[PDB]
Ligand binder design. Structure first.
Ligand code: MXH
Ligand code: CA
Length: 223
């Protein structure tokens, strides 16, 4: 997260870190057994880390749980990042508490101008590299689809939306992928991609979760 603020420990209790020896992507807890992340974060050997603030220090509220199965969206395209969503099942159910909590799925999509909370452990620099140990947060509005497509001609599908600031300076970044965009109490987005980070006229692009609620519900009921 570039241009954000330190969230405060466990203030985003649905945020998870995906770990394969090191943090490599975010995710969001959607019930005690299931996490939703970005398909481009897929790999084998995932450990889900819940209850985290400082990802380099054991602070006493963590749960570490191996994935038992991953399900990438059937229509995910790795060239274009269309349908950049996957589901991860936990080998054992998380113990839900004030620091380890699920986030509700949308029942409707959100509108341009609505303010959202975006979070993660990704790079904090728009030029260069600095990785934080504690969770970072950013408040940012959904942008109109026309401004999104104007920024990224030929690249935006109906399964994507832009959020952020066209002037630059405030954005998600490398290592935030897979993590949450929460608007009015609902998981509306997954951190997916952008051209650089926090650059002028290059806002963040997010998977449009509201298009996937039926697939999520049916997939988790059958697995
Ligand atoms: C290795 C594997 C095959 C799994 N792919 C993978 O890991 N991809 C991730 C995809 C997501 N990535 C990025 O977009 C990165 C960092 C980043 C991450 C999240 C949000 C933001 C932001 N600014 N909010 C920025 N930005 S980047 O360095 O410019 C870069 C490097 C390579 C590729 C594309 C890119 C751009 C556009 C499209 C779609 O048209 C695209 F498909 C890719 C951008 C990391 C890299
Ligand atoms: Ca920790």
């Amino acid at each position: 997260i570039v241009g954000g603020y330190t969230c405060g420990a466990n203030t985003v209790p649905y945020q998870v870190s995906l770990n394969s020896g090191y943090h490599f992507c975010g995710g969001s807890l959607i019930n005690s057994q299931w996490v939703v992340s970005a398909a481009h974060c897929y790999k084998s050997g995932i450990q889900v880390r819940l209850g985290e603030d400082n990802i380099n220090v054991v602070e006493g509220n963590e749960q570490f749980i191996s994935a038992s199965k991953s399900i990438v969206h059937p229509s995910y395209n790795s060239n274009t990042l269309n349908n950049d969503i996957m589901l991860i099942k936990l080998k054992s159910a998380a113990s839900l508490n004030s620091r380890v909590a699920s986030i509700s799925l949308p029942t409707s999509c959100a509108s341009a101008g609505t303010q959202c909370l975006i979070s993660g452990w990704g790079n904090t620099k728009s030029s260069g590299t600095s990785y934080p140990d504690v969770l970072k947060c950013l408040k940012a509005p959904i942008l109109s689809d026309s401004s999104c497509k104007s920024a990224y001609p030929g690249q935006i599908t109906s399964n994507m939306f832009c959020a952020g600031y066209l002037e630059g300076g405030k954005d998600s970044c490398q290592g935030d992928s897979g993590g949450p965009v929460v608007c009015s109490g609902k998981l509306q987005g997954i951190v997916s991609w952008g051209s650089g980070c926090a650059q002028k006229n290059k806002p963040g692009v997010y998977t449009k979760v509201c298009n996937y609620v039926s697939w999520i519900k049916q997939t988790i009921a059958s697995n």
